Amino acid sequence: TGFLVKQRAFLKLYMITMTEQERLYGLKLLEVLRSEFKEIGFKPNHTEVYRSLHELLDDGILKQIKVKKEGAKLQEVVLYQFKDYEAAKLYKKQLKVELDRSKKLIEKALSDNF
Amino acid sequence: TGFLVKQRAFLKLYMITMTEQERLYGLKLLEVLRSEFKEIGFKPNHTEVYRSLHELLDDGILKQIKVKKEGAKLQEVVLYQFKDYEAAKLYKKQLKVELDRSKKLIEKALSDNF
C-alpha cells in the first residue's frame, strides 16, 4: 500500500547493493550514482545522496571503515560495510514490494490514459 | 530528465482523461479515484485530489459547469469540462514522457538490485 517509492528509499537500496558488492566508497559516491542514472535522465540530488547514506548509518545498517591517505593531508578513504546485514536484507525485501507496486502503478497509468 | 512522476501530476493526468470521457464530476471524484487504485494499493490522499483539481482550474485547463440539485437545499452537481483542451493535450504529452522515464527507472532498479 502507498504511492510510488521515495527517492531516499531508492538511493538507499542502491547503496546497500553496492555495499554488498564491496563497492561503496565515500568519495566516488555521488558521482558514481549520477553517472549510473544520466542515461535515463535522473540526476541524484546532492543532499539526497548524503541523507540516504547517513540514515543508513544512523539506523545501524551500515558502518564506515576508514584508512588514511598517506598522500593527502587530512581526510581518508571511506569504505562502507554492513553493520547489520540482516536489517539490510529486510530493507531490500520491503523495497522489492515498493518497486513492484510502483511498476504496476506506472503501467496502469500508461494503459489507462494512453 | 528527473526522478519519478509526482502524485499531483499523476492525479491531474487521470482527471484530464476523465474529463475527456465526460466522467469528471465533483461528488464521486475522491471516492472514484480511491476505488480505481485500491486493488493495487494506492489510496489517493484527500488534499492531493482537491489540489490537483484546483491547479487544473486555476491553470485554466478545466472549468466547472454547474446545475442545482432540485432535491437538495444548496450545493449543486458539478461537471468538469475543458476550458483549454490544447493545454490539456500538451500536459498529457509531457506526462507520457514522465511515465516512460519512471517505468525505465523502476525497471532498472529491479534488475540492478534483484
Side-chain angles (χ1 to χ4, degrees):
Chain A
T1 181
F3 188 49
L4 301 176
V5 53
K6 285 191 170 307
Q7 182 179 166
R8 295 273 188 60
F10 185 89
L11 296 173
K12 286 183 182 182
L13 174 65
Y14 270 94
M15 303 183 167
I16 290 171
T17 289
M18 285 172 72
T19 297
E20 271 174 329
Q21 306 178 327
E22 311 171 305
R23 55 197 287 256
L24 221 212
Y25 293 98
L27 265 193
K28 288 294 200 305
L29 194 49
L30 176 59
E31 297 76 17
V32 170
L33 266 4
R34 287 180 164 173
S35 171
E36 180 79 71
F37 302 112
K38 49 80 160 51
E39 190 65 9
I40 276 61
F42 169 47
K43 185 178 187 304
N45 182 65
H46 203 136
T47 87
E48 227 60 51
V49 166
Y50 182 89
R51 279 186 289 188
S52 291
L53 174 59
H54 287 281
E55 267 169 46
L56 288 183
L57 287 164
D58 301 335
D59 282 9
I61 288 182
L62 290 180
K63 64 182 179 183
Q64 52 170 56
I65 272 81
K66 312 190 286 185
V67 163
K68 267 71 179 177
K69 278 276 199 190
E70 309 273 290
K73 68 172 185 177
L74 295 170
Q75 303 356 301
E76 59 273 281
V77 162
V78 190
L79 190 244
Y80 291 93
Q81 308 202 314
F82 286 121
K83 177 176 181 174
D84 194 327
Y85 188 46
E86 291 305 310
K89 295 202 300 291
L90 217 204
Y91 188 83
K92 265 213 165 191
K93 287 242 287 298
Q94 315 299 207
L95 254 290
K96 183 63 172 58
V97 179
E98 314 285 57
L99 290 180
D100 295 326
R101 191 192 61 234
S102 292
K103 184 190 172 68
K104 291 174 181 303
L105 227 33
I106 295 180
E107 254 153 40
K108 173 170 168 56
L110 285 159
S111 58
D112 284 345
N113 300 276
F114 297 101
Chain B
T1 181
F3 188 49
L4 301 176
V5 53
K6 285 191 170 307
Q7 182 179 166
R8 295 273 188 60
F10 185 89
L11 296 173
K12 286 183 182 182
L13 174 65
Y14 270 94
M15 303 183 167
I16 290 171
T17 289
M18 285 172 72
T19 297
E20 271 174 329
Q21 306 178 327
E22 311 171 305
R23 55 197 287 256
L24 221 212
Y25 293 98
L27 265 193
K28 288 294 200 305
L29 194 49
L30 176 59
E31 297 76 17
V32 170
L33 266 4
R34 287 180 164 173
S35 171
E36 180 79 71
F37 302 112
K38 49 80 160 51
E39 190 65 9
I40 276 61
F42 169 47
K43 185 178 187 304
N45 182 65
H46 203 136
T47 87
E48 227 60 51
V49 166
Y50 182 89
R51 279 186 289 188
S52 291
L53 174 59
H54 287 281
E55 267 169 46
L56 288 183
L57 287 164
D58 301 335
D59 282 9
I61 288 182
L62 290 180
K63 64 182 179 183
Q64 52 170 56
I65 272 81
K66 312 190 286 185
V67 163
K68 267 71 179 177
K69 278 276 199 190
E70 309 273 290
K73 68 172 185 177
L74 295 170
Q75 303 356 301
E76 59 273 281
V77 162
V78 190
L79 190 244
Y80 291 93
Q81 308 202 314
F82 286 121
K83 177 176 181 174
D84 194 327
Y85 188 46
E86 291 305 310
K89 295 202 300 291
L90 217 204
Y91 188 83
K92 265 213 165 191
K93 287 242 287 298
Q94 315 299 207
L95 254 290
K96 183 63 172 58
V97 179
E98 314 285 57
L99 290 180
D100 295 326
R101 191 192 61 234
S102 292
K103 184 190 172 68
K104 291 174 181 303
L105 227 33
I106 295 180
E107 254 153 40
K108 173 170 168 56
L110 285 159
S111 58
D112 284 345
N113 300 276
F114 297 101

PDB file of all heavy atoms in Angstrom, chain B residues 49-82:
ATOM      1  N   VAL B  49      -6.017  15.133  -4.085  1.00  0.00           N
ATOM      2  CA  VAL B  49      -7.054  15.115  -5.097  1.00  0.00           C
ATOM      3  C   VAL B  49      -7.620  16.519  -5.292  1.00  0.00           C
ATOM      4  O   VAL B  49      -7.737  17.001  -6.423  1.00  0.00           O
ATOM      5  CB  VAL B  49      -8.185  14.169  -4.686  1.00  0.00           C
ATOM      6  CG1 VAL B  49      -9.408  14.402  -5.557  1.00  0.00           C
ATOM      7  CG2 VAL B  49      -7.709  12.732  -4.806  1.00  0.00           C
ATOM      8  N   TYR B  50      -7.961  17.167  -4.182  1.00  0.00           N
ATOM      9  CA  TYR B  50      -8.525  18.512  -4.210  1.00  0.00           C
ATOM     10  C   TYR B  50      -7.553  19.518  -4.851  1.00  0.00           C
ATOM     11  O   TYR B  50      -7.963  20.362  -5.659  1.00  0.00           O
ATOM     12  CB  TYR B  50      -8.881  18.963  -2.781  1.00  0.00           C
ATOM     13  CG  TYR B  50      -9.508  20.339  -2.717  1.00  0.00           C
ATOM     14  CD1 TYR B  50     -10.891  20.507  -2.822  1.00  0.00           C
ATOM     15  CD2 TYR B  50      -8.711  21.483  -2.622  1.00  0.00           C
ATOM     16  CE1 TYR B  50     -11.468  21.786  -2.838  1.00  0.00           C
ATOM     17  CE2 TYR B  50      -9.275  22.765  -2.640  1.00  0.00           C
ATOM     18  CZ  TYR B  50     -10.650  22.910  -2.753  1.00  0.00           C
ATOM     19  OH  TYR B  50     -11.193  24.178  -2.824  1.00  0.00           O
ATOM     20  N   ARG B  51      -6.274  19.430  -4.490  1.00  0.00           N
ATOM     21  CA  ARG B  51      -5.273  20.348  -5.028  1.00  0.00           C
ATOM     22  C   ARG B  51      -4.998  20.102  -6.502  1.00  0.00           C
ATOM     23  O   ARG B  51      -4.719  21.039  -7.250  1.00  0.00           O
ATOM     24  CB  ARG B  51      -3.968  20.264  -4.225  1.00  0.00           C
ATOM     25  CG  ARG B  51      -3.997  21.061  -2.927  1.00  0.00           C
ATOM     26  CD  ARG B  51      -2.639  21.091  -2.211  1.00  0.00           C
ATOM     27  NE  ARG B  51      -2.283  19.802  -1.616  1.00  0.00           N
ATOM     28  CZ  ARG B  51      -1.238  19.601  -0.810  1.00  0.00           C
ATOM     29  NH1 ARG B  51      -0.437  20.615  -0.494  1.00  0.00           N
ATOM     30  NH2 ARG B  51      -0.989  18.386  -0.324  1.00  0.00           N
ATOM     31  N   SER B  52      -5.076  18.848  -6.930  1.00  0.00           N
ATOM     32  CA  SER B  52      -4.856  18.533  -8.335  1.00  0.00           C
ATOM     33  C   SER B  52      -5.945  19.223  -9.151  1.00  0.00           C
ATOM     34  O   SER B  52      -5.673  19.950 -10.099  1.00  0.00           O
ATOM     35  CB  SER B  52      -4.923  17.023  -8.565  1.00  0.00           C
ATOM     36  OG  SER B  52      -3.822  16.365  -7.968  1.00  0.00           O
ATOM     37  N   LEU B  53      -7.187  18.985  -8.750  1.00  0.00           N
ATOM     38  CA  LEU B  53      -8.349  19.556  -9.408  1.00  0.00           C
ATOM     39  C   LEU B  53      -8.264  21.072  -9.530  1.00  0.00           C
ATOM     40  O   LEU B  53      -8.452  21.634 -10.623  1.00  0.00           O
ATOM     41  CB  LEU B  53      -9.606  19.179  -8.635  1.00  0.00           C
ATOM     42  CG  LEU B  53     -10.944  19.779  -9.071  1.00  0.00           C
ATOM     43  CD1 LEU B  53     -11.239  19.395 -10.514  1.00  0.00           C
ATOM     44  CD2 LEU B  53     -12.049  19.275  -8.141  1.00  0.00           C
ATOM     45  N   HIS B  54      -7.973  21.735  -8.416  1.00  0.00           N
ATOM     46  CA  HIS B  54      -7.893  23.189  -8.419  1.00  0.00           C
ATOM     47  C   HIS B  54      -6.704  23.789  -9.136  1.00  0.00           C
ATOM     48  O   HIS B  54      -6.751  24.944  -9.549  1.00  0.00           O
ATOM     49  CB  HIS B  54      -8.018  23.711  -6.994  1.00  0.00           C
ATOM     50  CG  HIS B  54      -9.413  23.599  -6.468  1.00  0.00           C
ATOM     51  ND1 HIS B  54     -10.402  24.502  -6.799  1.00  0.00           N
ATOM     52  CD2 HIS B  54     -10.024  22.612  -5.770  1.00  0.00           C
ATOM     53  CE1 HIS B  54     -11.562  24.074  -6.330  1.00  0.00           C
ATOM     54  NE2 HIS B  54     -11.359  22.928  -5.703  1.00  0.00           N
ATOM     55  N   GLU B  55      -5.640  23.017  -9.296  1.00  0.00           N
ATOM     56  CA  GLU B  55      -4.497  23.524 -10.034  1.00  0.00           C
ATOM     57  C   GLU B  55      -4.908  23.520 -11.509  1.00  0.00           C
ATOM     58  O   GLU B  55      -4.560  24.426 -12.271  1.00  0.00           O
ATOM     59  CB  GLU B  55      -3.266  22.647  -9.797  1.00  0.00           C
ATOM     60  CG  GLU B  55      -2.404  23.166  -8.661  1.00  0.00           C
ATOM     61  CD  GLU B  55      -1.324  22.198  -8.226  1.00  0.00           C
ATOM     62  OE1 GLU B  55      -0.634  21.642  -9.106  1.00  0.00           O
ATOM     63  OE2 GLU B  55      -1.163  22.007  -6.994  1.00  0.00           O
ATOM     64  N   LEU B  56      -5.672  22.501 -11.898  1.00  0.00           N
ATOM     65  CA  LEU B  56      -6.150  22.396 -13.269  1.00  0.00           C
ATOM     66  C   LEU B  56      -7.133  23.544 -13.539  1.00  0.00           C
ATOM     67  O   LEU B  56      -7.197  24.080 -14.648  1.00  0.00           O
ATOM     68  CB  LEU B  56      -6.836  21.046 -13.493  1.00  0.00           C
ATOM     69  CG  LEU B  56      -5.931  19.808 -13.554  1.00  0.00           C
ATOM     70  CD1 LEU B  56      -6.774  18.562 -13.844  1.00  0.00           C
ATOM     71  CD2 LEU B  56      -4.877  20.008 -14.635  1.00  0.00           C
ATOM     72  N   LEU B  57      -7.902  23.913 -12.517  1.00  0.00           N
ATOM     73  CA  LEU B  57      -8.859  25.004 -12.628  1.00  0.00           C
ATOM     74  C   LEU B  57      -8.121  26.341 -12.693  1.00  0.00           C
ATOM     75  O   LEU B  57      -8.293  27.118 -13.638  1.00  0.00           O
ATOM     76  CB  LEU B  57      -9.799  25.009 -11.422  1.00  0.00           C
ATOM     77  CG  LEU B  57     -10.852  23.901 -11.389  1.00  0.00           C
ATOM     78  CD1 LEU B  57     -11.435  23.768  -9.996  1.00  0.00           C
ATOM     79  CD2 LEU B  57     -11.933  24.219 -12.413  1.00  0.00           C
ATOM     80  N   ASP B  58      -7.287  26.595 -11.690  1.00  0.00           N
ATOM     81  CA  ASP B  58      -6.536  27.841 -11.636  1.00  0.00           C
ATOM     82  C   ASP B  58      -5.617  28.002 -12.847  1.00  0.00           C
ATOM     83  O   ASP B  58      -5.354  29.128 -13.277  1.00  0.00           O
ATOM     84  CB  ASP B  58      -5.719  27.932 -10.341  1.00  0.00           C
ATOM     85  CG  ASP B  58      -6.586  27.851  -9.084  1.00  0.00           C
ATOM     86  OD1 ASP B  58      -7.784  28.185  -9.163  1.00  0.00           O
ATOM     87  OD2 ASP B  58      -6.064  27.466  -8.010  1.00  0.00           O
ATOM     88  N   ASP B  59      -5.139  26.894 -13.410  1.00  0.00           N
ATOM     89  CA  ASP B  59      -4.254  26.980 -14.569  1.00  0.00           C
ATOM     90  C   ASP B  59      -5.011  27.161 -15.878  1.00  0.00           C
ATOM     91  O   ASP B  59      -4.408  27.202 -16.958  1.00  0.00           O
ATOM     92  CB  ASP B  59      -3.356  25.749 -14.654  1.00  0.00           C
ATOM     93  CG  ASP B  59      -2.204  25.808 -13.678  1.00  0.00           C
ATOM     94  OD1 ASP B  59      -2.196  26.723 -12.825  1.00  0.00           O
ATOM     95  OD2 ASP B  59      -1.311  24.939 -13.757  1.00  0.00           O
ATOM     96  N   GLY B  60      -6.334  27.261 -15.778  1.00  0.00           N
ATOM     97  CA  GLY B  60      -7.151  27.462 -16.958  1.00  0.00           C
ATOM     98  C   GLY B  60      -7.367  26.272 -17.874  1.00  0.00           C
ATOM     99  O   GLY B  60      -7.871  26.438 -18.993  1.00  0.00           O
ATOM    100  N   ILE B  61      -6.996  25.075 -17.431  1.00  0.00           N
ATOM    101  CA  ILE B  61      -7.198  23.891 -18.266  1.00  0.00           C
ATOM    102  C   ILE B  61      -8.655  23.421 -18.196  1.00  0.00           C
ATOM    103  O   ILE B  61      -9.275  23.134 -19.218  1.00  0.00           O
ATOM    104  CB  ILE B  61      -6.260  22.724 -17.849  1.00  0.00           C
ATOM    105  CG1 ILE B  61      -4.821  23.049 -18.266  1.00  0.00           C
ATOM    106  CG2 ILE B  61      -6.728  21.423 -18.484  1.00  0.00           C
ATOM    107  CD1 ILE B  61      -3.825  21.956 -17.956  1.00  0.00           C
ATOM    108  N   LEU B  62      -9.194  23.359 -16.986  1.00  0.00           N
ATOM    109  CA  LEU B  62     -10.567  22.930 -16.791  1.00  0.00           C
ATOM    110  C   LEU B  62     -11.437  24.070 -16.294  1.00  0.00           C
ATOM    111  O   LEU B  62     -10.945  25.110 -15.852  1.00  0.00           O
ATOM    112  CB  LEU B  62     -10.638  21.789 -15.770  1.00  0.00           C
ATOM    113  CG  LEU B  62     -10.101  20.395 -16.111  1.00  0.00           C
ATOM    114  CD1 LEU B  62     -10.314  19.475 -14.911  1.00  0.00           C
ATOM    115  CD2 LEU B  62     -10.811  19.837 -17.346  1.00  0.00           C
ATOM    116  N   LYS B  63     -12.742  23.860 -16.373  1.00  0.00           N
ATOM    117  CA  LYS B  63     -13.712  24.831 -15.895  1.00  0.00           C
ATOM    118  C   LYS B  63     -14.866  24.008 -15.342  1.00  0.00           C
ATOM    119  O   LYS B  63     -15.054  22.858 -15.736  1.00  0.00           O
ATOM    120  CB  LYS B  63     -14.195  25.733 -17.035  1.00  0.00           C
ATOM    121  CG  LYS B  63     -14.947  25.010 -18.132  1.00  0.00           C
ATOM    122  CD  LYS B  63     -15.357  25.963 -19.242  1.00  0.00           C
ATOM    123  CE  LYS B  63     -16.088  25.213 -20.346  1.00  0.00           C
ATOM    124  NZ  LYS B  63     -16.463  26.069 -21.504  1.00  0.00           N
ATOM    125  N   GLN B  64     -15.627  24.574 -14.412  1.00  0.00           N
ATOM    126  CA  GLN B  64     -16.737  23.829 -13.855  1.00  0.00           C
ATOM    127  C   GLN B  64     -18.101  24.312 -14.354  1.00  0.00           C
ATOM    128  O   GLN B  64     -18.394  25.504 -14.360  1.00  0.00           O
ATOM    129  CB  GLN B  64     -16.672  23.825 -12.317  1.00  0.00           C
ATOM    130  CG  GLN B  64     -16.539  25.177 -11.647  1.00  0.00           C
ATOM    131  CD  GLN B  64     -16.732  25.090 -10.139  1.00  0.00           C
ATOM    132  OE1 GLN B  64     -16.043  24.330  -9.450  1.00  0.00           O
ATOM    133  NE2 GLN B  64     -17.678  25.868  -9.621  1.00  0.00           N
ATOM    134  N   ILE B  65     -18.889  23.362 -14.863  1.00  0.00           N
ATOM    135  CA  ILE B  65     -20.253  23.602 -15.346  1.00  0.00           C
ATOM    136  C   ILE B  65     -21.153  23.102 -14.209  1.00  0.00           C
ATOM    137  O   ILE B  65     -21.036  21.959 -13.773  1.00  0.00           O
ATOM    138  CB  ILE B  65     -20.584  22.788 -16.637  1.00  0.00           C
ATOM    139  CG1 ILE B  65     -20.168  23.563 -17.896  1.00  0.00           C
ATOM    140  CG2 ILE B  65     -22.076  22.506 -16.711  1.00  0.00           C
ATOM    141  CD1 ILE B  65     -18.688  23.470 -18.243  1.00  0.00           C
ATOM    142  N   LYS B  66     -22.057  23.947 -13.731  1.00  0.00           N
ATOM    143  CA  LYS B  66     -22.897  23.551 -12.609  1.00  0.00           C
ATOM    144  C   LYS B  66     -24.405  23.645 -12.789  1.00  0.00           C
ATOM    145  O   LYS B  66     -24.916  24.538 -13.464  1.00  0.00           O
ATOM    146  CB  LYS B  66     -22.492  24.361 -11.378  1.00  0.00           C
ATOM    147  CG  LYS B  66     -20.996  24.371 -11.163  1.00  0.00           C
ATOM    148  CD  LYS B  66     -20.614  24.967  -9.834  1.00  0.00           C
ATOM    149  CE  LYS B  66     -20.758  26.465  -9.818  1.00  0.00           C
ATOM    150  NZ  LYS B  66     -20.243  26.997  -8.508  1.00  0.00           N
ATOM    151  N   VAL B  67     -25.098  22.699 -12.164  1.00  0.00           N
ATOM    152  CA  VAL B  67     -26.552  22.636 -12.173  1.00  0.00           C
ATOM    153  C   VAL B  67     -27.035  22.342 -10.750  1.00  0.00           C
ATOM    154  O   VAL B  67     -26.468  21.500 -10.055  1.00  0.00           O
ATOM    155  CB  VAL B  67     -27.065  21.537 -13.132  1.00  0.00           C
ATOM    156  CG1 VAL B  67     -28.510  21.209 -12.821  1.00  0.00           C
ATOM    157  CG2 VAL B  67     -26.958  22.019 -14.577  1.00  0.00           C
ATOM    158  N   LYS B  68     -28.076  23.047 -10.321  1.00  0.00           N
ATOM    159  CA  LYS B  68     -28.639  22.867  -8.980  1.00  0.00           C
ATOM    160  C   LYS B  68     -29.412  21.562  -8.805  1.00  0.00           C
ATOM    161  O   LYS B  68     -30.155  21.147  -9.693  1.00  0.00           O
ATOM    162  CB  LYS B  68     -29.587  24.027  -8.636  1.00  0.00           C
ATOM    163  CG  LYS B  68     -28.965  25.199  -7.884  1.00  0.00           C
ATOM    164  CD  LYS B  68     -28.019  26.019  -8.744  1.00  0.00           C
ATOM    165  CE  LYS B  68     -27.458  27.183  -7.942  1.00  0.00           C
ATOM    166  NZ  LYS B  68     -26.457  27.983  -8.699  1.00  0.00           N
ATOM    167  N   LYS B  69     -29.229  20.921  -7.655  1.00  0.00           N
ATOM    168  CA  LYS B  69     -29.942  19.690  -7.322  1.00  0.00           C
ATOM    169  C   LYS B  69     -31.319  20.132  -6.823  1.00  0.00           C
ATOM    170  O   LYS B  69     -31.429  20.650  -5.711  1.00  0.00           O
ATOM    171  CB  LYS B  69     -29.228  18.952  -6.188  1.00  0.00           C
ATOM    172  CG  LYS B  69     -28.046  18.088  -6.589  1.00  0.00           C
ATOM    173  CD  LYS B  69     -28.519  16.720  -7.055  1.00  0.00           C
ATOM    174  CE  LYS B  69     -27.393  15.699  -7.021  1.00  0.00           C
ATOM    175  NZ  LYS B  69     -27.785  14.428  -7.690  1.00  0.00           N
ATOM    176  N   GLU B  70     -32.364  19.944  -7.626  1.00  0.00           N
ATOM    177  CA  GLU B  70     -33.707  20.358  -7.205  1.00  0.00           C
ATOM    178  C   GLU B  70     -34.186  19.525  -6.007  1.00  0.00           C
ATOM    179  O   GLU B  70     -35.282  19.745  -5.483  1.00  0.00           O
ATOM    180  CB  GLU B  70     -34.710  20.217  -8.363  1.00  0.00           C
ATOM    181  CG  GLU B  70     -34.284  20.867  -9.684  1.00  0.00           C
ATOM    182  CD  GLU B  70     -34.675  22.333  -9.790  1.00  0.00           C
ATOM    183  OE1 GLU B  70     -35.883  22.629  -9.909  1.00  0.00           O
ATOM    184  OE2 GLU B  70     -33.771  23.191  -9.752  1.00  0.00           O
ATOM    185  N   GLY B  71     -33.355  18.576  -5.579  1.00  0.00           N
ATOM    186  CA  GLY B  71     -33.711  17.727  -4.457  1.00  0.00           C
ATOM    187  C   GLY B  71     -32.978  18.030  -3.160  1.00  0.00           C
ATOM    188  O   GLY B  71     -33.384  17.559  -2.097  1.00  0.00           O
ATOM    189  N   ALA B  72     -31.904  18.815  -3.230  1.00  0.00           N
ATOM    190  CA  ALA B  72     -31.135  19.152  -2.031  1.00  0.00           C
ATOM    191  C   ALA B  72     -30.986  20.662  -1.823  1.00  0.00           C
ATOM    192  O   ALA B  72     -30.737  21.409  -2.773  1.00  0.00           O
ATOM    193  CB  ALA B  72     -29.765  18.498  -2.103  1.00  0.00           C
ATOM    194  N   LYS B  73     -31.140  21.111  -0.578  1.00  0.00           N
ATOM    195  CA  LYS B  73     -31.013  22.534  -0.270  1.00  0.00           C
ATOM    196  C   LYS B  73     -29.551  22.952  -0.407  1.00  0.00           C
ATOM    197  O   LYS B  73     -28.667  22.407   0.266  1.00  0.00           O
ATOM    198  CB  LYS B  73     -31.513  22.844   1.152  1.00  0.00           C
ATOM    199  CG  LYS B  73     -30.653  22.266   2.276  1.00  0.00           C
ATOM    200  CD  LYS B  73     -31.092  22.767   3.648  1.00  0.00           C
ATOM    201  CE  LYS B  73     -30.136  22.283   4.734  1.00  0.00           C
ATOM    202  NZ  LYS B  73     -30.478  22.801   6.093  1.00  0.00           N
ATOM    203  N   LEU B  74     -29.307  23.918  -1.292  1.00  0.00           N
ATOM    204  CA  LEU B  74     -27.963  24.427  -1.546  1.00  0.00           C
ATOM    205  C   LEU B  74     -27.120  23.401  -2.291  1.00  0.00           C
ATOM    206  O   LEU B  74     -27.550  22.268  -2.516  1.00  0.00           O
ATOM    207  CB  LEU B  74     -27.268  24.791  -0.229  1.00  0.00           C
ATOM    208  CG  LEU B  74     -27.871  25.949   0.569  1.00  0.00           C
ATOM    209  CD1 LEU B  74     -27.228  26.024   1.949  1.00  0.00           C
ATOM    210  CD2 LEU B  74     -27.672  27.244  -0.205  1.00  0.00           C
ATOM    211  N   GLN B  75     -25.920  23.817  -2.678  1.00  0.00           N
ATOM    212  CA  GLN B  75     -24.976  22.956  -3.386  1.00  0.00           C
ATOM    213  C   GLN B  75     -25.515  22.379  -4.697  1.00  0.00           C
ATOM    214  O   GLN B  75     -26.726  22.212  -4.875  1.00  0.00           O
ATOM    215  CB  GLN B  75     -24.500  21.843  -2.443  1.00  0.00           C
ATOM    216  CG  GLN B  75     -23.851  22.374  -1.153  1.00  0.00           C
ATOM    217  CD  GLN B  75     -23.729  23.902  -1.132  1.00  0.00           C
ATOM    218  OE1 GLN B  75     -23.089  24.502  -2.001  1.00  0.00           O
ATOM    219  NE2 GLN B  75     -24.350  24.534  -0.138  1.00  0.00           N
ATOM    220  N   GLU B  76     -24.603  22.062  -5.611  1.00  0.00           N
ATOM    221  CA  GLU B  76     -25.002  21.558  -6.911  1.00  0.00           C
ATOM    222  C   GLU B  76     -24.243  20.343  -7.440  1.00  0.00           C
ATOM    223  O   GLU B  76     -23.421  19.745  -6.750  1.00  0.00           O
ATOM    224  CB  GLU B  76     -24.891  22.698  -7.932  1.00  0.00           C
ATOM    225  CG  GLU B  76     -23.485  23.288  -8.059  1.00  0.00           C
ATOM    226  CD  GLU B  76     -23.187  24.409  -7.061  1.00  0.00           C
ATOM    227  OE1 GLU B  76     -23.625  25.561  -7.294  1.00  0.00           O
ATOM    228  OE2 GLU B  76     -22.508  24.136  -6.047  1.00  0.00           O
ATOM    229  N   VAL B  77     -24.564  19.984  -8.679  1.00  0.00           N
ATOM    230  CA  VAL B  77     -23.923  18.889  -9.395  1.00  0.00           C
ATOM    231  C   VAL B  77     -22.863  19.568 -10.256  1.00  0.00           C
ATOM    232  O   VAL B  77     -23.175  20.452 -11.052  1.00  0.00           O
ATOM    233  CB  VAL B  77     -24.932  18.168 -10.286  1.00  0.00           C
ATOM    234  CG1 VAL B  77     -24.216  17.356 -11.338  1.00  0.00           C
ATOM    235  CG2 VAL B  77     -25.812  17.280  -9.429  1.00  0.00           C
ATOM    236  N   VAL B  78     -21.609  19.174 -10.083  1.00  0.00           N
ATOM    237  CA  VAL B  78     -20.515  19.794 -10.823  1.00  0.00           C
ATOM    238  C   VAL B  78     -19.916  18.887 -11.881  1.00  0.00           C
ATOM    239  O   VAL B  78     -19.424  17.794 -11.592  1.00  0.00           O
ATOM    240  CB  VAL B  78     -19.390  20.248  -9.864  1.00  0.00           C
ATOM    241  CG1 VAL B  78     -18.368  21.099 -10.605  1.00  0.00           C
ATOM    242  CG2 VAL B  78     -19.984  21.013  -8.700  1.00  0.00           C
ATOM    243  N   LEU B  79     -19.960  19.346 -13.120  1.00  0.00           N
ATOM    244  CA  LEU B  79     -19.407  18.572 -14.214  1.00  0.00           C
ATOM    245  C   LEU B  79     -18.207  19.366 -14.674  1.00  0.00           C
ATOM    246  O   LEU B  79     -18.258  20.594 -14.770  1.00  0.00           O
ATOM    247  CB  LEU B  79     -20.420  18.432 -15.351  1.00  0.00           C
ATOM    248  CG  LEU B  79     -20.194  17.476 -16.541  1.00  0.00           C
ATOM    249  CD1 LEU B  79     -20.067  18.298 -17.820  1.00  0.00           C
ATOM    250  CD2 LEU B  79     -18.992  16.581 -16.333  1.00  0.00           C
ATOM    251  N   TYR B  80     -17.106  18.674 -14.914  1.00  0.00           N
ATOM    252  CA  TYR B  80     -15.938  19.371 -15.375  1.00  0.00           C
ATOM    253  C   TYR B  80     -15.749  19.206 -16.866  1.00  0.00           C
ATOM    254  O   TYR B  80     -15.928  18.124 -17.418  1.00  0.00           O
ATOM    255  CB  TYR B  80     -14.703  18.907 -14.606  1.00  0.00           C
ATOM    256  CG  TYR B  80     -14.739  19.352 -13.158  1.00  0.00           C
ATOM    257  CD1 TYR B  80     -15.263  18.528 -12.158  1.00  0.00           C
ATOM    258  CD2 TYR B  80     -14.319  20.630 -12.799  1.00  0.00           C
ATOM    259  CE1 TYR B  80     -15.371  18.979 -10.836  1.00  0.00           C
ATOM    260  CE2 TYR B  80     -14.423  21.085 -11.483  1.00  0.00           C
ATOM    261  CZ  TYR B  80     -14.949  20.258 -10.511  1.00  0.00           C
ATOM    262  OH  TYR B  80     -15.057  20.724  -9.222  1.00  0.00           O
ATOM    263  N   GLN B  81     -15.419  20.305 -17.525  1.00  0.00           N
ATOM    264  CA  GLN B  81     -15.188  20.271 -18.956  1.00  0.00           C
ATOM    265  C   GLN B  81     -13.911  21.030 -19.223  1.00  0.00           C
ATOM    266  O   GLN B  81     -13.434  21.778 -18.380  1.00  0.00           O
ATOM    267  CB  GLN B  81     -16.337  20.937 -19.729  1.00  0.00           C
ATOM    268  CG  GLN B  81     -17.727  20.427 -19.382  1.00  0.00           C
ATOM    269  CD  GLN B  81     -18.735  20.696 -20.491  1.00  0.00           C
ATOM    270  OE1 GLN B  81     -18.794  21.799 -21.040  1.00  0.00           O
ATOM    271  NE2 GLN B  81     -19.533  19.688 -20.823  1.00  0.00           N
ATOM    272  N   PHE B  82     -13.363  20.837 -20.409  1.00  0.00           N
ATOM    273  CA  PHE B  82     -12.145  21.514 -20.798  1.00  0.00           C
ATOM    274  C   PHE B  82     -12.402  22.973 -21.129  1.00  0.00           C
ATOM    275  O   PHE B  82     -13.376  23.320 -21.799  1.00  0.00           O
ATOM    276  CB  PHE B  82     -11.517  20.821 -22.018  1.00  0.00           C
ATOM    277  CG  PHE B  82     -10.867  19.501 -21.696  1.00  0.00           C
ATOM    278  CD1 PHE B  82     -11.294  18.331 -22.311  1.00  0.00           C
ATOM    279  CD2 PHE B  82      -9.822  19.435 -20.773  1.00  0.00           C
ATOM    280  CE1 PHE B  82     -10.685  17.105 -22.013  1.00  0.00           C
ATOM    281  CE2 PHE B  82      -9.213  18.219 -20.469  1.00  0.00           C
ATOM    282  CZ  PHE B  82      -9.642  17.052 -21.088  1.00  0.00           C
TER     283      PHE B  82
END
